[PDB]
Amino acid sequence: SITENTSWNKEFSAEAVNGVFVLCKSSSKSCATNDLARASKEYLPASTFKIPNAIIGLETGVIKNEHQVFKWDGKPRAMKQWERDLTLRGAIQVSAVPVFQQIAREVGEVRMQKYLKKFSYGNQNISGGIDKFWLEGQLRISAVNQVEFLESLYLNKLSASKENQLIVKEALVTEAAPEYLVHSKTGWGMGVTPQVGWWVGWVEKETEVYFFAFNMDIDNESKLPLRKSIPTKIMESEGIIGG
Amino acid sequence: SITENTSWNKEFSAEAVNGVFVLCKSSSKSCATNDLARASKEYLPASTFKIPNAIIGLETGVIKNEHQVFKWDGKPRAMKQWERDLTLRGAIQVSAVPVFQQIAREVGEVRMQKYLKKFSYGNQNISGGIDKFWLEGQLRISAVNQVEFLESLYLNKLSASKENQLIVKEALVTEAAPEYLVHSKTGWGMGVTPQVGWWVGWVEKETEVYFFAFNMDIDNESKLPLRKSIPTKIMESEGIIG
């Protein structure tokens, strides 16, 4: 029942990129997209996988609780922003891949498989190595499936404790005003061709809720801000951002 | 022992503010204040009482859950900002008193009394009527006590489920930045003299956490923003926010 809104395409052509936005009001039963085909196409999740990985980390006890500090061992990491002790929120905010690869390692394949099945997480293919599958492996998930998973998270309906779902929700908050709250997560998947850029999340505005998932083909770093600006312009046209 | 930091008085001086800031790193065992006497003095909590009231409401069942919508009945309310449907977070963040009056009535005197004893909340005096004790009744709490209560909340150590503590915690998020996160709640107690203004909460930056409570006398309504600006300037100067 997802509907196509072809006018949204102008926000993609204005920036010379290919991609999809899916936007649902209230539930995943009222969704619209600029491109019906791509809305259902599955792409490497990259750093958006920190959302399930975090929940799974808490459920399995690998992450002890919300106050867990991920200590840096001092050995060098691929970005300087990652070279420091991090909270769960901090590790999510900076997209600290090494923290999550250690989480995945301790969770292990059999349990990670079990959770991705419970979560109906895309093609649930975690081959490509326990700490790499969402980065250069065979895992793939669509914008539509992202929206469905995030709706279950918002509702505390994933197969995980309410407490753990709440902890991860707080960690994902990226904008806050009295009657406007955004939970969101970016991704940039360099380990696939073409590279994929993601922005997924949900907006609570007054008493309404909107689920969203965006992805695009990324040539390189310079186009990364479009992951937020294109969704922002669509949501503005829909009356979500302003008043 | 809480230490006195006279220096902070400089931020109170230009605006002639009579007030106190309490700021603790990691725990309420490591606190400082500009004014030891005022730090421990108890003031009417006004809208800051929405924090325990929300938790009590959830713990009793009076508040259904995180997703409960508080419908406006169309009858005029004291503030236009309150004349709409509100989520729990909305009701807390716009300080929608009538929503919390109804919650308090449904909680009731016996339960409310017991939870303030469990939370060690100030003087625990709820006389004045069940729906006005924190507005114009006799309940009073100090800045030090606000910090101790907020620390317990942070740590999920109040006598309430971890889930209900977590619900209220997300409801208190007020600033979400890449480097830090702020949970806070304002208050303006117009039902006492002098009028009291509050800002209480905590800040998480890097791997550290700081609890804070600020109050001041409000000589007039134009001085209201000082309830955030003075403690923000102090916490900015120490590196806690920014």
Ligand SMILES: *C(=O)[C@@H]([C@@H]1N=C(C(=O)O)[C@@H](S[C@@H]2CN[C@H](C(=O)Nc3cccc(C(=O)O)c3)C2)[C@@H]1C)[C@@H](C)O
């Ligand atoms: C995930 O897909 C991927 C990440 N995603 C990235 C991206 O979106 O660019 C990079 S890491 C990313 C780049 N910008 C942020 C950042 O540094 N922000 C930030 C936020 C809060 C605080 C601070 C700070 O205090 O320094 C910084 C992180 C990477 C390619 C994985 C799979 O590689």
